[PDB]
mmCIF file of C-alpha atoms and ligand atoms in Angstrom:
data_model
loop_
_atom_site.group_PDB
_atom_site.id
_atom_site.type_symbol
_atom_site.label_atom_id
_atom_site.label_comp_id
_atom_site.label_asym_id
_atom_site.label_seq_id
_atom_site.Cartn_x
_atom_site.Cartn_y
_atom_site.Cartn_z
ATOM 1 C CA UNK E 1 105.421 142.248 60.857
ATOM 2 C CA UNK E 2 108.714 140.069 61.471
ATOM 3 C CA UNK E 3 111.755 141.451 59.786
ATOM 4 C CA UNK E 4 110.297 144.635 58.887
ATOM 5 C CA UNK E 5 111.315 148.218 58.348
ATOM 6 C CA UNK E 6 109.579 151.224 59.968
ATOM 7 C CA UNK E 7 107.073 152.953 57.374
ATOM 8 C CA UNK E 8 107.805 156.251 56.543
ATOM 9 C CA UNK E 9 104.014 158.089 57.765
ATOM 10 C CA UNK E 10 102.787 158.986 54.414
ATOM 11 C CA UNK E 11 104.006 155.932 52.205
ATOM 12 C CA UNK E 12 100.564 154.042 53.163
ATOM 13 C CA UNK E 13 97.841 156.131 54.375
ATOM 14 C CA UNK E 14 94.871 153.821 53.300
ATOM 15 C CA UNK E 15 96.209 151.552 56.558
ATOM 16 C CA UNK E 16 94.046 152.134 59.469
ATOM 17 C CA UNK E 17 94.771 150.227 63.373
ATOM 18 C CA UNK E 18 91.547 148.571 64.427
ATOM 19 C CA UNK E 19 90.976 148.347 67.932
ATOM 20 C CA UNK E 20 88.955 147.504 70.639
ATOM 21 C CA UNK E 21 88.264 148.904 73.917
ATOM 22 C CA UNK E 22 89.882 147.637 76.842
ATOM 23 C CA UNK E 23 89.222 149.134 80.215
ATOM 24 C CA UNK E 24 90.355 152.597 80.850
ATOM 25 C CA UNK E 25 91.913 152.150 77.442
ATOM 26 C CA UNK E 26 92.177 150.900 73.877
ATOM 27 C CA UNK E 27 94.100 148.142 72.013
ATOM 28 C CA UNK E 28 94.960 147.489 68.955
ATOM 29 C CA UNK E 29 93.981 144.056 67.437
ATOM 30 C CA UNK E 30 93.956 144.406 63.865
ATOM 31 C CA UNK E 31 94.746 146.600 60.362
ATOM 32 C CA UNK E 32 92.056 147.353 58.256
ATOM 33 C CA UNK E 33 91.894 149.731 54.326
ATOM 34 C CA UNK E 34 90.106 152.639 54.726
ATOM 35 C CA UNK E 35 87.991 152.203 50.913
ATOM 36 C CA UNK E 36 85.971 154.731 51.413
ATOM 37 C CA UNK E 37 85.671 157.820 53.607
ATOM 38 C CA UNK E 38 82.990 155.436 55.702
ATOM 39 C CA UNK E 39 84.411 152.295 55.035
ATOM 40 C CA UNK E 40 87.133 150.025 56.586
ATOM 41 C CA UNK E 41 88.068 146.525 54.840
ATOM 42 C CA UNK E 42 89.683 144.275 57.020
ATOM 43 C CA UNK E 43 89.676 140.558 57.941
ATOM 44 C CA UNK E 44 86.111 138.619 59.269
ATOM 45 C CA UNK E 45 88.052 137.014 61.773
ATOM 46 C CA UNK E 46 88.986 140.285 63.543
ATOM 47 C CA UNK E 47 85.670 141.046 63.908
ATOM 48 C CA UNK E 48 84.201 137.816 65.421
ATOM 49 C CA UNK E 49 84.585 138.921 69.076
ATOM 50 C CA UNK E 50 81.677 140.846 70.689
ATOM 51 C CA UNK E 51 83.608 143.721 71.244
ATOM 52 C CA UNK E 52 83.753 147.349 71.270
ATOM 53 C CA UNK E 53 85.613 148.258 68.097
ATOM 54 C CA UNK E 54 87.381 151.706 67.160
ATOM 55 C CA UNK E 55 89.023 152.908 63.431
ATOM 56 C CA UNK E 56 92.224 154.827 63.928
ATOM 57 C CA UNK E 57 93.055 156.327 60.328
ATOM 58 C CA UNK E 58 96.309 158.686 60.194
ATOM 59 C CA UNK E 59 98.539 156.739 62.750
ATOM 60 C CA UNK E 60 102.094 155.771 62.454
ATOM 61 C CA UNK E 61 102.917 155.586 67.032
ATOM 62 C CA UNK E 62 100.204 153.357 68.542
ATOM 63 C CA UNK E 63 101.895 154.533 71.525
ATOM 64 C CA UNK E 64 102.826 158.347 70.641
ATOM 65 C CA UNK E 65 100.553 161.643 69.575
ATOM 66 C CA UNK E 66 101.556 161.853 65.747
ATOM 67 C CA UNK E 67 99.316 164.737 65.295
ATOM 68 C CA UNK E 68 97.912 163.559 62.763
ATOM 69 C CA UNK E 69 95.222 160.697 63.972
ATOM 70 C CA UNK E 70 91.685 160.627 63.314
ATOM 71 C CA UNK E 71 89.416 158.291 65.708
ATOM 72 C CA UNK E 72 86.090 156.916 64.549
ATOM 73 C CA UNK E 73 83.480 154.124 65.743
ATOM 74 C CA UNK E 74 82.364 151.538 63.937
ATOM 75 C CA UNK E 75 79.115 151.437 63.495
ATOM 76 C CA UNK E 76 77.699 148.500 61.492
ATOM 77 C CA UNK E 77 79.726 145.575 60.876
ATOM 78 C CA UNK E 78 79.276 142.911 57.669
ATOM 79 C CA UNK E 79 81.212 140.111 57.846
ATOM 80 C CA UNK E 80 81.471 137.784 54.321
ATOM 81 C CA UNK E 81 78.166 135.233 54.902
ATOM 82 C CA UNK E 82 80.240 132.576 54.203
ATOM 83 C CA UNK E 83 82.593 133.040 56.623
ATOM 84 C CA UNK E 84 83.268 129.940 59.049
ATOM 85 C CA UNK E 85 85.321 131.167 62.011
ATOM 86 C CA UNK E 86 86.342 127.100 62.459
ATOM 87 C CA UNK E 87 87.703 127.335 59.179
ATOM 88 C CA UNK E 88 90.155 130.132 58.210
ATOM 89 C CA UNK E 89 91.264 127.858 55.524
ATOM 90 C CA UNK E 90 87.834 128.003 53.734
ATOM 91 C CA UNK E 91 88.317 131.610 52.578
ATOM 92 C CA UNK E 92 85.777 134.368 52.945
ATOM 93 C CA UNK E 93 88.436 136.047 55.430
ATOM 94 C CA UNK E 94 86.786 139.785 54.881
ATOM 95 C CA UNK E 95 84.420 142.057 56.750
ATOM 96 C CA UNK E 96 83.541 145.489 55.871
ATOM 97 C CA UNK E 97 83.230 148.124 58.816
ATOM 98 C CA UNK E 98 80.752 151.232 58.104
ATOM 99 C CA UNK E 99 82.601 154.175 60.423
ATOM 100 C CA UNK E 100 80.221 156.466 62.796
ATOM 101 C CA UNK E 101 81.885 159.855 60.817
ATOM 102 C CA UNK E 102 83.155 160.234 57.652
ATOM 103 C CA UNK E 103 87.016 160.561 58.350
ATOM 104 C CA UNK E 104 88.869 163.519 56.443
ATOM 105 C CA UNK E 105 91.138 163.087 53.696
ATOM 106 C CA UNK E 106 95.059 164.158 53.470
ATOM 107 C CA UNK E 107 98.718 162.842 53.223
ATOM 108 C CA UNK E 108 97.611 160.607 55.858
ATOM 109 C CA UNK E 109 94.881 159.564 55.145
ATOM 110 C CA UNK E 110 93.392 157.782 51.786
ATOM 111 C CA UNK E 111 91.378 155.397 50.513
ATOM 112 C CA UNK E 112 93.423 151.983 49.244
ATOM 113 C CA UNK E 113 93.117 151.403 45.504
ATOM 114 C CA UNK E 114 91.473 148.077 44.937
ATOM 115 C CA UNK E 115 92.303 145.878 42.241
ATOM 116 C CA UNK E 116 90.087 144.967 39.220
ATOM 117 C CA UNK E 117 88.053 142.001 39.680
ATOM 118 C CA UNK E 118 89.823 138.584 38.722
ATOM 119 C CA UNK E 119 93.560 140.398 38.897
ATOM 120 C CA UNK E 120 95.992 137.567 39.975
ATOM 121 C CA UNK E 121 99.376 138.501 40.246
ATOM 122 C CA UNK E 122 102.267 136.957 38.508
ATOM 123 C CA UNK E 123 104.726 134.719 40.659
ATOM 124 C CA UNK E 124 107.015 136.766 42.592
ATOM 125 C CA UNK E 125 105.354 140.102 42.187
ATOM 126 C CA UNK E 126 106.749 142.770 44.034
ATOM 127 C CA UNK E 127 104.336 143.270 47.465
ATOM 128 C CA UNK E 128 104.628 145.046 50.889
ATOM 129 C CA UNK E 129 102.710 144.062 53.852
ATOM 130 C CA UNK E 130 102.238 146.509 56.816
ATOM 131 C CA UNK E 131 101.147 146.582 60.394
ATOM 132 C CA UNK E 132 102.060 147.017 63.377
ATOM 133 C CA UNK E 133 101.694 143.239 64.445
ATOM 134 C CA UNK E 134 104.158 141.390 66.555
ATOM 135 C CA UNK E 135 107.797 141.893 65.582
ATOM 136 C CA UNK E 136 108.866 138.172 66.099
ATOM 137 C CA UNK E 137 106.855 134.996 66.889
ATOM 138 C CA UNK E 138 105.238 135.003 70.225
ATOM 139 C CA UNK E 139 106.532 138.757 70.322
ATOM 140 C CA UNK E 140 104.860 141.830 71.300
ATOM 141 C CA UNK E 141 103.417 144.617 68.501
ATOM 142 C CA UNK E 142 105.574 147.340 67.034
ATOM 143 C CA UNK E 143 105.012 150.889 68.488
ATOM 144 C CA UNK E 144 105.564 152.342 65.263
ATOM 145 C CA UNK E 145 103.952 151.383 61.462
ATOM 146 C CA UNK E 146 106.475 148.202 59.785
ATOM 147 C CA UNK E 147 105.953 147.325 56.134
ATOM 148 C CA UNK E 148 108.006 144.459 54.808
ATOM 149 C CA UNK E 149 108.631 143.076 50.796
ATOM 150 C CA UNK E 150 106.930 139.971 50.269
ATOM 151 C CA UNK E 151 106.478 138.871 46.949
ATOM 152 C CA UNK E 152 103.978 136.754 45.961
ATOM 153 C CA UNK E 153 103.640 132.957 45.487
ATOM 154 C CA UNK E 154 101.355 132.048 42.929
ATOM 155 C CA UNK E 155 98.711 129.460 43.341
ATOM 156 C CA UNK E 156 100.997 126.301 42.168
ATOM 157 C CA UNK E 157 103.342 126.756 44.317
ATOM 158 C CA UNK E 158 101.635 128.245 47.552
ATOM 159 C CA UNK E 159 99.278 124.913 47.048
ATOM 160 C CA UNK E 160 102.218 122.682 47.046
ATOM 161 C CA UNK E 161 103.358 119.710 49.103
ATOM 162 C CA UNK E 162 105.701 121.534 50.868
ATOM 163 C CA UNK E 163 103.932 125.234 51.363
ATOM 164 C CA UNK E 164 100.240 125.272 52.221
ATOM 165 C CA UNK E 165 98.719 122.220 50.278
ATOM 166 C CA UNK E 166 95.097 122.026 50.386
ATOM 167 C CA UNK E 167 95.120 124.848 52.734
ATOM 168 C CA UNK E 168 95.190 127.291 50.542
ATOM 169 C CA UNK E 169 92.854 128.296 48.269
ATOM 170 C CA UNK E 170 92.378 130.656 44.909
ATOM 171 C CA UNK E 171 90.728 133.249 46.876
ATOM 172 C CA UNK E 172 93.794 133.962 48.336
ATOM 173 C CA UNK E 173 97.037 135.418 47.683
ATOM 174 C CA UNK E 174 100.313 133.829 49.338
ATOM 175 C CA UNK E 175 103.268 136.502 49.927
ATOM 176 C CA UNK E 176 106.631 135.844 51.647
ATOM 177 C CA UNK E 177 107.780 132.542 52.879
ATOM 178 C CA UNK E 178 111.336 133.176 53.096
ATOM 179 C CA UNK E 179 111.678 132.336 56.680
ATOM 180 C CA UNK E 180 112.933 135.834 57.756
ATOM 181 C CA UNK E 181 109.990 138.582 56.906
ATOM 182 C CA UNK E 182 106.010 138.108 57.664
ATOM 183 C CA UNK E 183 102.766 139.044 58.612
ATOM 184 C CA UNK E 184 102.030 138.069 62.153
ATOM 185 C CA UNK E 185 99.622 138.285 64.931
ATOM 186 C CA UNK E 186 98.017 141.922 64.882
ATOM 187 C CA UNK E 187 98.736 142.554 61.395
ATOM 188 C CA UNK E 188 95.491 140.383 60.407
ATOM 189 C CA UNK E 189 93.058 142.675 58.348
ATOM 190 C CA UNK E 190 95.064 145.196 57.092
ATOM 191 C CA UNK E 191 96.535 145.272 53.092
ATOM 192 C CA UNK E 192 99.085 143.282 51.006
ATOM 193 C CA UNK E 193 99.896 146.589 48.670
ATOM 194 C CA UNK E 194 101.553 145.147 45.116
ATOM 195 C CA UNK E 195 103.045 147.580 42.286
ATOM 196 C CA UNK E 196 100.850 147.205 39.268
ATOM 197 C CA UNK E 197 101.615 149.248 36.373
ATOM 198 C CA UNK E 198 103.063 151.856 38.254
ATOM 199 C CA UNK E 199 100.994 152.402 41.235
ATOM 200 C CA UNK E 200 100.329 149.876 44.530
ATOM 201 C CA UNK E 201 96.672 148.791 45.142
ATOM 202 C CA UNK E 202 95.452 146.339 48.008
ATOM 203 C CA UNK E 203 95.687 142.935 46.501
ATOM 204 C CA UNK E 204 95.247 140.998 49.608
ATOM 205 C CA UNK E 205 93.601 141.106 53.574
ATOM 206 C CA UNK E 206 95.667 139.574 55.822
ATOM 207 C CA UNK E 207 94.570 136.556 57.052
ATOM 208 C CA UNK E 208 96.619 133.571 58.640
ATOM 209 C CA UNK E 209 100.284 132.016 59.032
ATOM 210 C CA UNK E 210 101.547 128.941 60.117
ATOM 211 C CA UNK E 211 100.330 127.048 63.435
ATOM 212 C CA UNK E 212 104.496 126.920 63.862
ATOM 213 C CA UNK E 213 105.654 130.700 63.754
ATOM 214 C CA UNK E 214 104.824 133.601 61.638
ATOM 215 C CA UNK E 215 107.920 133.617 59.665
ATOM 216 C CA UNK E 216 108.373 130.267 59.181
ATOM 217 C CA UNK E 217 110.088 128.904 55.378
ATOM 218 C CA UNK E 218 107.722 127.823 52.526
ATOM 219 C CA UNK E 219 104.608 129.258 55.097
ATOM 220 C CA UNK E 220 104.159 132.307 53.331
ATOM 221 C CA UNK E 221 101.814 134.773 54.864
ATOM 222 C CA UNK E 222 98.499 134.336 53.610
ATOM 223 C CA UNK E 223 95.872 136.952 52.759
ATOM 224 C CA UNK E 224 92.414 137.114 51.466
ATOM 225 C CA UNK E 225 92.132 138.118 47.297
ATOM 226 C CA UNK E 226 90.583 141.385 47.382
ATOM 227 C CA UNK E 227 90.001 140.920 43.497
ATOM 228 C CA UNK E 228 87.794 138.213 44.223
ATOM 229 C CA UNK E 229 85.560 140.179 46.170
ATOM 230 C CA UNK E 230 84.912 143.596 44.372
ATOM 231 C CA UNK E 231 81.408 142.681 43.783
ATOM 232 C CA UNK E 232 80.803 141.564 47.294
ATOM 233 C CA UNK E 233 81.912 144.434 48.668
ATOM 234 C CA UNK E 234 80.364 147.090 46.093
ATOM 235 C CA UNK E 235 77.033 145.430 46.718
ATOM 236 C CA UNK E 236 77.614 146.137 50.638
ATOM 237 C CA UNK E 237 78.464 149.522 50.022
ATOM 238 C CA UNK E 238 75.683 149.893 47.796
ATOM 239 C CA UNK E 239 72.983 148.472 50.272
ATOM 240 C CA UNK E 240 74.156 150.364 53.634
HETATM 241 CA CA1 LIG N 301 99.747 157.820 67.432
#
């Protein structure tokens, strides 16, 4: 997240850090929902590598014990059947992870309130992304949880000349775009949270920003609907 704020550790505990294993180690790669106690939402195109993957629910330091984390493998991975890793721009940026354990509820840990199917947000609705993805273009990730207020461009205008054009689709929500706060890389798969009446669900998956920079003007960052897919992924929950 460029031109974030640091999270305070319970505001957003359905946010899990996806990572792979590297080594002697681990390294975070993407964000991800915890939706169920067995169930991480995050973005297809995290998953496409071959790789070992862990689900870190309850963390706020990737580099620090917060006493508070709760490690799990993922055990089955379903990726959207449409998705096209050639073609981000397509849509279908969402995979669902089925953990190893069931993780444990508490302050810091909770499943993300979807939307209900078909919700599209008005223009400029009030949104925070979080992650702990690079801090500035071709920077390095944030130690600690960042959340920043993006508010949301509506269809019209995120398929405009001068945003995304073509490139965007109504599958997706746009957020941000002012040129100073974003997503960026390492903050893929994880939520878009948007105040509803009263109380934030996970309206989008973060998916892509611009080729030139992450917070780049009239490039909002741009995230996969989740209220497009409710059916999609209650049938995969359903079926494994
Ligand atoms: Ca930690």
């Amino acid at each position: 997240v460029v031109g974030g704020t640091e999270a305070q550790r319970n505001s957003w505990p359905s946010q899990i850090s996806l990572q792979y294993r590297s080594g002697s180690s681990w390294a975070h790669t993407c964000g991800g929902t915890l939706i169920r106690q067995n169930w991480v939402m995050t973005a297809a195109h995290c998953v496409d590598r071959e790789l070992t993957f862990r689900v870190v629910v309850g963390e706020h330091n990737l580099n620090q014990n917060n006493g508070t984390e709760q490690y799990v493998g993922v055990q089955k991975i379903v990726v959207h059947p449409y998705w096209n890793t050639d073609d981000v721009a397509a849509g279908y940026d969402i995979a669902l992870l089925r953990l190893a354990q069931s993780v444990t509820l508490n302050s810091y840990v909770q499943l993300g309130v979807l939307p209900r199917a078909g919700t599209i947000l008005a223009n400029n609705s009030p949104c925070y992304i979080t992650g702990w993805g690079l801090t500035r273009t071709n920077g390095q990730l944030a130690q600690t949880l960042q959340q920043a207020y993006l508010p949301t461009v509506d269809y019209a205008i995120c398929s405009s000349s001068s945003y995304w054009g073509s490139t965007v689709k109504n599958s997706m929500v746009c957020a941000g775009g002012d040129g100073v706060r974003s997503g960026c890389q390492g903050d893929s798969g994880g939520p878009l949270h948007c105040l509803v009446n009263g109380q934030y669900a996970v309206h989008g998956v973060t998916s892509f920003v611009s080729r030139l920079g992450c917070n780049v003007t009239r490039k909002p960052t741009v995230f996969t609907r989740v209220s497009a897919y409710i059916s999609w992924i209650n049938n995969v929950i359903a079926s494994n």
